[PDB]
């Protein structure tokens, strides 16, 4: 039979309808008064969190981060530039907002490592994402068969090197065939043309 | 007043001094910032790729 979790999932398919709509309209009022990174005891989307690796266990942390909506907050050129490079308004950053959110969270918890993250909506001027971070030094995690992998040295600052799920998709690594000629194995090894 | 020799006479102000962190006489005592190692501005050591030729 349907899991209870399937109901949370189904509700989030349409965040502008039903009970969820009323919930968001109420919550965001409190969220807009909260800071940039807020640690929360329980995930707003339990199903999504568990699906991404979350566990109600010691050393597993969740935090909601708000990031402004829109394009690059860019300064206009202050020296010679050909027309092509004179733009300001239409330039957008190459890292998606979700990834920015993930980095802001990881910076807040220097000892923790980003496991994954997901969206929890947006209003007219900002987006919110909840990031799942893990304590690679806590023994409750070092002994977990499903999570201990994140404790390895080569996983340090994984979010900053694009090793996150949002990092990998944003790097164009989703496809294994056509279209990934300049993305795999890395954008840098491919000359930065991905 | 000439901008050369006659203007060199008022130069008795101490600015750059021996830096606590790197030992170079670059710690600007007015700014409390070393122009050589970055002490006072950054925890990381001041360094730039342009301090050497590009392919080196």
């Amino acid at each position: 039979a349907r899991s209870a979790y399937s109901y949370i999932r189904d509700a989030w398919k349409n965040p502008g309808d039903g009970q969820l709509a009323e919930l968001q309209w109420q919550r965001q009022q409190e969220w807009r008064n909260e800071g940039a990174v807020e640690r929360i005891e329980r995930p707003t989307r339990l199903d999504k969190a568990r699906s991404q690796g979350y566990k109600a266990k010691q050393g597993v942390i969740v935090a909601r981060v708000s990031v402004r909506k829109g394009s690059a907050r860019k300064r206009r050129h202050k020296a010679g530039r050909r027309s092509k490079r004179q733009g300001v308004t239409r330039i957008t950053r190459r890292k998606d907002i979700q990834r920015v959110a993930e980095e802001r969270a990881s910076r807040t918890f220097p000892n923790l490592r980003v496991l994954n993250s997901y969206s929890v909506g947006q209003d007219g001027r900002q987006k919110w994402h909840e990031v799942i971070l893990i304590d690679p030094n806590h023994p409750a995690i070092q002994n977990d068969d499903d999570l201990s992998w994140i404790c390895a040295d080569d996983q340090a600052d994984r979010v900053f090197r694009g090793l996150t799920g949002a990092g990998r998709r944003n790097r164009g690594l989703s496809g294994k065939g056509k279209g990934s000629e300049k993305t795999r194995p890395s954008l840098r090894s491919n000359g930065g043309k991905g | 007043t000439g901008a050369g020799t006659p203007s060199q006479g008022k130069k008795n102000t101490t600015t750059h001094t021996k830096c606590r962190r790197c030992g170079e006489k670059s710690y600007h005592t007015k700014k409390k910032v070393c122009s050589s190692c970055g002490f006072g501005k950054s925890a990381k050591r001041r360094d730039y790729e342009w301090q050497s030729k590009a392919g080196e």
Binding site: - | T14, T17, K18, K25
Partner: protein
Amino acid sequence: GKKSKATKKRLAKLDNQNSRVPAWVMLKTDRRNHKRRHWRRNDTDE
């Protein structure tokens, strides 16, 4: 000017470094202080 205790230690060291290569070092090495500094002609740090 007003020198601090640390500045003073450094000035003291510079003065000591300003001595000559002892006579016996000449004999021992079978034959110059490249750091001879004059107060007027040269300039110390700080």
